[PDB]
Design a protein around this motif. Structure first.
Motif, PDB file in Angstrom:
ATOM      1  N   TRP A  53       0.438  -0.614   0.072  1.00 54.54           N
ATOM      2  CA  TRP A  53       0.004  -0.324   0.056  1.00 54.54           C
ATOM      3  C   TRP A  53       0.777   1.008   0.018  1.00 54.54           C
ATOM      4  O   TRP A  53       2.327   0.653   0.208  1.00 54.54           O
ATOM      5  CB  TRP A  53      -1.243   0.155   1.622  1.00 54.54           C
ATOM      6  N   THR A  61      -5.827   9.210   1.906  1.00 55.62           N
ATOM      7  CA  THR A  61      -6.066   8.339   0.855  1.00 55.62           C
ATOM      8  C   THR A  61      -4.978   6.951   0.625  1.00 55.62           C
ATOM      9  O   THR A  61      -3.755   7.586   0.577  1.00 55.62           O
ATOM     10  CB  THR A  61      -6.157   9.063  -0.607  1.00 55.62           C
ATOM     11  N   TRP A  62      -5.105   5.870   0.637  1.00 54.39           N
ATOM     12  CA  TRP A  62      -4.411   4.829   0.824  1.00 54.39           C
ATOM     13  C   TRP A  62      -5.202   4.177  -0.136  1.00 54.39           C
ATOM     14  O   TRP A  62      -6.128   3.537  -0.230  1.00 54.39           O
ATOM     15  CB  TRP A  62      -4.474   4.177   2.023  1.00 54.39           C
ATOM     16  N   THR A  63      -4.069   3.952  -0.800  1.00 55.03           N
ATOM     17  CA  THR A  63      -4.079   2.469  -2.314  1.00 55.03           C
ATOM     18  C   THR A  63      -3.173   1.517  -1.786  1.00 55.03           C
ATOM     19  O   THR A  63      -1.737   1.717  -1.944  1.00 55.03           O
ATOM     20  CB  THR A  63      -3.577   3.525  -3.252  1.00 55.03           C
ATOM     21  N   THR A  65      -2.561  -2.429  -2.709  1.00 54.93           N
ATOM     22  CA  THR A  65      -2.598  -3.481  -4.129  1.00 54.93           C
ATOM     23  C   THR A  65      -2.247  -5.307  -3.652  1.00 54.93           C
ATOM     24  O   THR A  65      -1.710  -5.895  -2.715  1.00 54.93           O
ATOM     25  CB  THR A  65      -0.680  -3.880  -4.767  1.00 54.93           C
ATOM     26  N   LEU A 112     -10.176   0.597  -8.383  1.00 55.18           N
ATOM     27  CA  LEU A 112      -9.146   1.341  -8.849  1.00 55.18           C
ATOM     28  C   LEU A 112      -9.109  -0.101 -10.117  1.00 55.18           C
ATOM     29  O   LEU A 112     -10.270   0.201 -10.746  1.00 55.18           O
ATOM     30  CB  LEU A 112      -7.849   1.928  -8.586  1.00 55.18           C
ATOM     31  N   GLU A 116      -6.256  -2.708  -7.560  1.00 57.19           N
ATOM     32  CA  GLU A 116      -6.442  -1.208  -6.310  1.00 57.19           C
ATOM     33  C   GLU A 116      -7.149  -1.300  -6.038  1.00 57.19           C
ATOM     34  O   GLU A 116      -8.295  -1.060  -6.402  1.00 57.19           O
ATOM     35  CB  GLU A 116      -5.531  -0.469  -7.587  1.00 57.19           C
ATOM     36  N   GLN A 118      -8.385   1.324  -3.194  1.00 58.09           N
ATOM     37  CA  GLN A 118      -8.652   3.260  -2.911  1.00 58.09           C
ATOM     38  C   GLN A 118      -9.934   3.325  -1.458  1.00 58.09           C
ATOM     39  O   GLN A 118     -11.089   4.040  -2.150  1.00 58.09           O
ATOM     40  CB  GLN A 118      -8.981   4.615  -4.031  1.00 58.09           C
ATOM     41  N   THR A 120     -10.477   6.067   1.261  1.00 58.38           N
ATOM     42  CA  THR A 120     -10.284   7.717   2.011  1.00 58.38           C
ATOM     43  C   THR A 120     -10.563   7.974   3.026  1.00 58.38           C
ATOM     44  O   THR A 120     -11.846   7.193   3.120  1.00 58.38           O
ATOM     45  CB  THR A 120     -10.558   8.586   1.005  1.00 58.38           C
TER      46      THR A 120
END
Ligand SMILES: O=C(O)CC[C@H](CC(=O)O)C(=O)O
Ligand SMILES: [Cl-]
Ligand SMILES: [Cl-]
Ligand code: NI
Length: 498
Positions: A53, A61-63, A65, A112, A116, A118, A120
């Motif tokens: 991540w 905001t966190w992404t 994988t 995403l 991915e 996302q 937030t």
């Protein structure tokens, strides 16, 4: 039949909705459902379902994988779109999860790509990853298992991506779990676990003695503690008592006469012989508790003053407060009302009952009349929601909920802790500071907010701490050592080599 094992649990495991609470049993939920990120003993987290991540600089905001190679179970794929749908399914029931501040924080979740995710948040929320690690609610059921497009109303079949599968469940007889063969992680050595549903402690001990039960695992209530102490002496059994994990107390109702009076709550703290209670009821297997949190709990080594057993102090406090002995009675009166207090508790738990009688007898010596109301478990939760108790058994939650999640939950208009705290002039202050405890990034700030909160709860005698309790294990010697999970509520079946 190696490599299968039999256990007991005093109730069925439940519907196994990953996103609801009672009667789903947390160790079971944790057997089937997995998180983005897995909690570790050091307090950190490690990648799990989420391989990686990154976060925005403002930290909101966190992404993540996700891992590519994970499938429920029933074959269906685990991908960002499934995760997003779970979060959405959770947040439709948001007011139920309000005890967990993370719930109050997720602003949205967006898939995403296939890999991915996302999330937030309304703030840079430092307890994010650890709260995502929790048995519940931020764990993933196959969206193909919703009812409508909801989980809050029920699910169809408990399909998750965990190492264990609910094969079969027969109220109130047994639950069967089989090892998941298409599991992305390490293969568990055990291929089947059977929970015999056995509500009574003595019967659980007899069942272990018959040879039919491979493992018993649980808290102070697991079996009777004098039999456990026999079992521990038996060269043909194996037993374990962990270090303490959580605290067991009464909660006193500050918004309800007479426990609304400080003096009364203090006289009750003084009137109970805790060590005598623990050696008797709990067989000296557990330790004496002076504070909501043991000193070994992070942020909680505060040197708070113990209330030691002191019936003259107690009955002086009562006296000064206008609770007086009228000619001919055992029980004090103020303006003609007796000092009566209702203690409520699961009418069928042997420990609560024994503790209750001791407590009753100890107060009686200071002119306080406590009446025991033993009732149905659902009735107990209800009064805890309701605010309908004088005194109520209650416990803390174990790592990693203590102190931070357990304090968070105190704010939410229902359950036990908000209700018991409702009558303190101090209460809006305490709720603001809990909030600040969860917001602040400065450890020095954190140290002081915790001191201020716990100190106030302690000096206002909201609680009567009783003991610090341990996990307990009884097992066949062939299973070897049985490990403890970093989350106190989990059982780590996958680590057992039979
Ligand atoms: O850890 C615990 O005992 C309780 C934490 C949370 C509380 C709830 O029921 O509102 C839950 O049960 O997951
Ligand atoms: Cl909303
Ligand atoms: Cl609770
Ligand atoms: Ni709970």
């Amino acid at each position: 039949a190696p490599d299968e094992i039999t256990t007991a649990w005093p109730v069925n495991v439940g519907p196994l909705n990953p996103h609801l609470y009672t009667p789903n049993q947390m160790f079971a939920q944790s057997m089937v459902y997995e998180p983005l990120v897995k909690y570790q003993a050091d307090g950190s987290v490690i990648p799990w379902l989420a391989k990686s991540w990154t976060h925005s600089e403002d930290g909101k905001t966190w992404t993540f994988t996700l891992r590519d190679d994970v499938k429920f179970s029933n074959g269906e794929p685990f991908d960002a779109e499934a995760a997003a749908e779970n979060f959405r399914a959770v947040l439709d029931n948001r007011q139920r999860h309000a005890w967990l501040e993370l719930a109050n924080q997720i602003v949205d979740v967006k898939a995403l790509s296939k890999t991915e995710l996302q999330i937030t948040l309304k703030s840079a929320y430092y307890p994010f990853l650890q709260e995502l690690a929790l048995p519940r609610p931020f764990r993933f059921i196959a969206p193909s298992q919703f009812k409508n497009h909801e989980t809050m109303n029920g699910i169809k079949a408990p399909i998750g991506t965990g190492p264990w599968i609910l094969q079969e469940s027969k109220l109130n007889q047994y639950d069967v779990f089989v090892r998941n063969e298409n599991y992305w992680g390490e293969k568990p050595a055990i291929k089947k676990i059977t929970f015999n549903v056995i509500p009574d402690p003595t019967t659980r001990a007899v069942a272990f003695e018959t040879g039919d039960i491979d493992l018993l695992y649980g808290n102070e209530g697991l079996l009777p503690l004098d039999t456990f102490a026999r079992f521990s002496q038996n060269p043909a059994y194996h037993t374990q008592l962990s270090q303490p994990i959580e605290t067991v107390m009464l909660a006193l109702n500050t918004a309800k006469a007479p426990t609304n009076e400080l003096a009364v709550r203090e006289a009750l703290n003084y009137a109970v012989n805790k060590k005598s209670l623990i050696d008797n009821a709990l067989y000296g297997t557990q330790q004496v508790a002076d504070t909501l949190f043991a000193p070994s709990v992070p942020y909680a080594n505060l040197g708070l003053k113990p209330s030691q057993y002191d019936p003259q102090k107690a009955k002086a406090l009562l006296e000064k407060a206008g609770w007086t002995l009228p000619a001919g009675k055992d029980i004090r009166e103020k303006n003609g009302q007796p000092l009566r207090i209702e203690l409520s508790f699961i009418g069928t738990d042997a420990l609560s009952k024994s503790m209750a009688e001791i407590i009753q007898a100890d107060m009686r010596q200071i002119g306080a009349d406590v009446s025991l109301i033993g009732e149905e478990e659902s009735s107990i939760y209800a009064r805890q929601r309701d605010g309908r108790f004088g005194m109520i058994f209650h416990r803390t939650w174990g790592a990693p909920y203590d102190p931070h999640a357990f304090l968070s939950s105190m704010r939410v208009p229902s359950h036990a802790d908000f209700q018991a705290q409702q009558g303190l002039a101090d209460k809006p202050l305490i709720d603001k500071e809990i909030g600040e405890v969860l917001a602040t990034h400065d450890e020095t700030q954190r140290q002081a907010l915790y001191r201020d909160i716990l100190t106030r709860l302690h000096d206002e005698a909201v609680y009567l701490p009783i003991s610090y309790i341990s996990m307990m294990v009884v097992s066949k010697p062939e299973l070897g050592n049985i490990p403890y999970a970093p989350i106190a509520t989990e059982i780590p079946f996958e680590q057992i080599k039979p």
